[PDB]
């Protein structure tokens, strides 16, 4: 497996800079009410109140939040990436995994060259800089991309893995929380390797349990989780009911309609389906089911109808004001 991990550089921020060449240096916070490096350098983050940041650097612009454009910009780059992979797994709106093993019959050097091309190309078409990582599995491809996220191009070759793994810290591993990492560094686990010194229960107690199996696997480079030709970006359509009720002959037609539209706005069989029932309070009540298979419009109606019944066996007195569906994990191609 020769996985290539693509990751757009401070996307929202870099997109703006592209339309607004002005700020081709100027510390730009990308705000969302109801941020690029130059401003990020001044302690700026993502997840901490807008107040502070543009206070902690009021000189920093707080440009609007135009997600529909970041989306059309990300849909275009992703299609530009599909052509270059035996298969692609769109992670988020600006992160993808490509398995190109065969587009290059297992030749690692030829993957690094491909990556150098893909990096190029996205530049001549969207003029965006991306940071990729070429490695044996997905976890190494990502971890190495980050070690040089600033328009980088990491490369972990098959034979330099067990080495790399040795000198790999805990604070550089995906899925581990910074809060959980701080706990592990207190108990003396600095490198991924030190994980092996502890014995599982001592570890599960701390990390999740799922992260324990994860870390351990990673530690020994077992963790060879495949790239799945599928998009993890969800899509949902919800309808308002005539008036709030608990009928079914009335709700169901209005759920199948939500299903048909969520289905028209997606590009392939969904593997998960979720019946979202907004009720009389204003307040959510959900329950969906994931199929490895792939689903289809057919069972969509059938299965939806079941999750709906259950939700109706979950809150009573409470009628229903709007039914929806949230399709996810769209098997593509």
Curated annotation (Swiss-Prot):
Superkingdom per UniProt: Archaea
Which coarse location class applies to the principal site listed for this UniProt protein?
Answer: cytoplasm
- Keywords assigned by UniProt? Cytoplasm, DNA damage, DNA repair, DNA replication, DNA-binding, DNA-directed DNA polymerase, Magnesium, Metal-binding, Mutator protein, Nucleotidyltransferase, Transferase
Quote the InterPro entries the UniProt record gives.
Answer: DNA/RNA_pol_sf, DNA_pol_Y-fam_lit_finger_sf, DNA_polymerase-Y, DNApol_IV, PolY_HhH_motif, Rev_trsase/Diguanyl_cyclase, UmuC
Q: Extract one GO BP annotation from the record.
A: DNA-templated DNA replication
Record keywords: Ligase included?
no
Please tell me where Mg(2+) binds in this chain.
Answer: 7, 94
Record's subcellular location:
Cytoplasm
The cofactor note from the UniProt entry for this protein is:
Binds 2 magnesium ions per subunit.
Domain UmuC: residue ranges: 3-177
Which cofactors go with this protein? Mg(2+)
Recorded catalytic reaction(s): these are: DNA(n) + a 2'-deoxyribonucleoside 5'-triphosphate = DNA(n+1) + diphosphate
Q: Name one GO cellular component term.
A: cytoplasm
Where do the coiled-coil regions begin and end? none
Could you name the active-site residues?
95
Annotated GO MF terms = damaged DNA binding; DNA-directed DNA polymerase activity; magnesium ion binding
Task: Share what the entry says about its subunit structure, partners included.
Answer: Monomer.
Q: Which family does it belong to?
A: Belongs to the DNA polymerase type-Y family.
What does the domain comment read?
Answer: The catalytic core consists of fingers, palm and thumb subdomains, but the fingers and thumb subdomains are much smaller than in high-fidelity polymerases; residues from five sequence motifs of the Y-family cluster around an active site cleft that can accommodate DNA and nucleotide substrates with relaxed geometric constraints, with consequently higher rates of misincorporation and low processivity. It lacks the O helices present in high-fidelity DNA polymerases in the fingers domain.
Q: Which PANTHER family match?
A: DNA POLYMERASE KAPPA, DNA REPAIR POLYMERASE UMUC / TRANSFERASE FAMILY MEMBER
Its biological purpose is as follows: Poorly processive, error-prone DNA polymerase involved in untargeted mutagenesis. Copies undamaged DNA at stalled replication forks, which arise in vivo from mismatched or misaligned primer ends. These misaligned primers can be extended by PolIV. Exhibits no 3'-5' exonuclease (proofreading) activity. May be involved in translesional synthesis.
Q: What is this protein called?
A: DNA polymerase IV
* Organism, as annotated: Saccharolobus solfataricus (Sulfolobus solfataricus)
